[PDB]
């Protein structure tokens, strides 16, 4: 006889601060380096895949997930929180914008559902916030290319470049200098790889590096070369071999 | 410390039992004293009823639950009502569903489960009232002791309430005598009165105080209250 509990696990403090949220801000800091660059001409997201036994593999791990075909997401914070959140987020996006619509969700609108979920878990006791902050990078035809940031509270903000994970401020500061105005998507990949090189040390391989762009949708990414019937992915992960070429080219 | 192990019912302590069970047990004794005796053909309960005042009067604490079934309490009146209501539904169903008069053994086990269940929550609680449940079915007369912990023992005579032991030792003596007085309403009633007096040591034995209840081979559940116990004193 149980399920009578609903007293909150997130309370106000005497500085009007929120206890769990302070705790969770650390969790993000103890993560690994992930970045985003919007080139206007696309979006590039990259992270370090790292793993917790030498016998494990990080080639068979993933830290970018497809949320819907044309949108991919990445995080800094704790692995468990990220997996349950991605699943719930994938569920609402299908149900409410492809059974009520048929066009894949505009990006910002998808951000608002992820944000609502995370805040909902903060209001209500017997659940606690998710301990993670996302950069959800997408494309939509009526927005163009987009980049959003979701904070662990549930708060959002747009950015045209940002960085998260260890040495967050300093990584972001580096982007400001190396990239101004509008430059290419290609060129921004070259930059993103360098920026990710300076954060990390002791791994430099393309089997521990994952870089993906949202920047093209080919029949090759459509799974059929016939006449289109849906938009299909605009998400594309660049190969371990592909990553390796570009490190040499810095 | 104390407040840890009283303030929760879904706990246990190092002794092998929670403190709340020790207090509930104490509470049965805080009841007024009542004895129960049987020879296994008839079963009698003889009970000393106290009333608060000269300006109060007696209210019932021997409860007809059927015309072949009843109980006496000792302990907490509020709780006793809750339990009595349960046994009564239970008696009714047994008749409707099985044509049974309900054995004590079957009833006890069912009362146990509910009790257990309310220690499996916060804001439920043990009853803290004990009952001597009697009835006459086809395996004869029966006397059970129910405790709000869930301990069910059938005894040939027993007592609950303050100074249980006084009657109980008298009962272990007179035992062999009473069990071979078989088939007598009047010999057993007389015994009950004799018994209850070995409990007493700070209380008076008076007509209006005392109350007798019977069920037995040729008696469906009939109570003697008030006036009608004078002739067994």
């Amino acid at each position: 006889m149980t399920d009578r509990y609903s007293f909150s696990l997130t309370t106000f403090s005497p500085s009007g601060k929120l206890g769990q949220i302070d705790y969770a801000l650390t969790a993000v800091k103890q993560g690994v380096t992930s970045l985003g660059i919007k080139a206007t001409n696309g979006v590039v997201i990259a992270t370090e895949k790292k793993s917790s036994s030498p016998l494990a593999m990080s080639e068979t791990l993933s830290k970018v997930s497809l949320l819907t075909p044309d949108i991919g997401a990445v995080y800094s914070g704790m692995g468990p929180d990220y997996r349950v959140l991605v699943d719930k987020s994938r569920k609402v996006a299908h149900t409410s914008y492809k059974r009520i619509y048929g066009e894949y969700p505009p990006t910002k609108l998808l951000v608002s559902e992820v944000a609502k979920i995370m805040q909902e878990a903060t209001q209500s006791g017997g659940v606690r916030p998710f301990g993670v902050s996302l950069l959800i990078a997408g494309h939509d035809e009526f927005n163009g290319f987009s980049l959003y940031q979701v904070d662990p509270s549930g708060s959002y903000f747009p950015w045209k470049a940002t960085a998260i994970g260890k040495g967050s401020v300093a990584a972001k500061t580096f982007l400001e200098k190396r990239w101004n105005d509008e430059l290419e998507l290609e060129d921004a990949i070259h930059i993103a790889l360098l920026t990710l090189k300076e954060s990390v040390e002791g791994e430099f391989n393309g089997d521990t590096i994952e870089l993906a762009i949202i920047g093209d949708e080919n029949p090759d990414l459509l799974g059929y070369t016939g006449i289109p019937t849906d938009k299909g992915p605009r998400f594309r992960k660049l190969t371990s071999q592909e990553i390796n070429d570009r490190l040499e080219a810095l | 410390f104390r407040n840890n192990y009283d303030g929760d019912t879904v706990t246990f302590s190092p002794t092998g039992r929670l403190f709340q069970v020790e207090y509930a047990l104490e509470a049965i004794k805080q009841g007024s004293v009542t004895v129960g005796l049987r020879s296994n053909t008839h079963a009698v309960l003889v009970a000393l009823k106290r009333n608060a005042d000269e300006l109060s009067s007696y209210q019932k604490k021997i409860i007809k639950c059927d015309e072949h079934m009843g109980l006496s309490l000792a302990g907490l009146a509020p709780d006793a009502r809750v339990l009595s209501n349960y046994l009564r539904q239970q008696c009714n169903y047994s008749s409707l569903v099985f044509n049974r008069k309900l054995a004590v053994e079957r009833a006890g086990h069912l009362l146990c489960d509910k009790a257990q269940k309310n220690t499996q929550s916060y804001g439920g609680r043990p009853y803290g009232v004990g009952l001597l449940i009697i009835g006459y079915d086809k395996s004869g007369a029966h006397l059970l002791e129910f405790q709000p912990s869930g301990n069910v023992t059938e005894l040939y005579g027993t007592a609950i309430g303050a100074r249980s032991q006084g009657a109980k030792t008298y009962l272990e003596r007179t035992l062999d005598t009473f069990i071979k007085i078989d088939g007598n309403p009047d010999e057993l009633i007389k015994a009950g009165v004799e018994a209850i007096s070995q409990s007493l040591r700070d209380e008076s034995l008076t007509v209006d105080n005392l109350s007798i209840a019977i069920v037995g081979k040729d008696t469906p559940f009939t109570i003697y209250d008030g006036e009608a116990v004078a002739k067994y004193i």
Binding site: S65, R99, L222, Y224, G226, T229 | -
Partner: protein
Amino acid sequence: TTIVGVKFNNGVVIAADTRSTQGPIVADKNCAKLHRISPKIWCAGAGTAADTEAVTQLIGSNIELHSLYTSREPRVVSALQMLKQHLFKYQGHIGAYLIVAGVDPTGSHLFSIHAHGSTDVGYYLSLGSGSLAAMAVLESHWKQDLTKEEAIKLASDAIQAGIWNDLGSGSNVDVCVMEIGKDAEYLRNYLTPNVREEKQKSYKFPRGTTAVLKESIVNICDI
């Protein structure tokens, strides 16, 4: 309509005609009867228009949700089972006669589904109003050692049999080749073989016979 599915030793062809009728009058020369579930699980549907399309989108959604969840290809047998459990709950209220086809790493598959709630596995299957005439062609000319060119060519012949002898069928024929080895080909309007119901010509209307009681203008606006 006439919907078919034909197995070859390298892939599967489904095909359909795209004519929607209200009476003998042709409402639509084009509506897809071939619906995409995932890039390589295509489904043909016959019967009542509204029902086949809606069910196919619900399943279509649940399968894509599945594919992302498992980080693996979707199986044809998942789509099949979703379809069966959906028909079963609604006890036939869904009136979808479906031909579900797919290629996976397990091989090429061909099943069909009645609205009645029974599924079957076949080497070639057909459903529709053109179902009798088409299933006749397909059983006769199907052979062991079938190939791509032979499977398209057979598939054209099928739809055509149903056009000719069921005259509620007609209009364009859309074909979809799904190969295990190479990226599937949806062939919109692969054949353009029949036309619109009869016209006599029409011509300009004189303005001494078309008159206006009053008129205004107005404008579209959005805050």
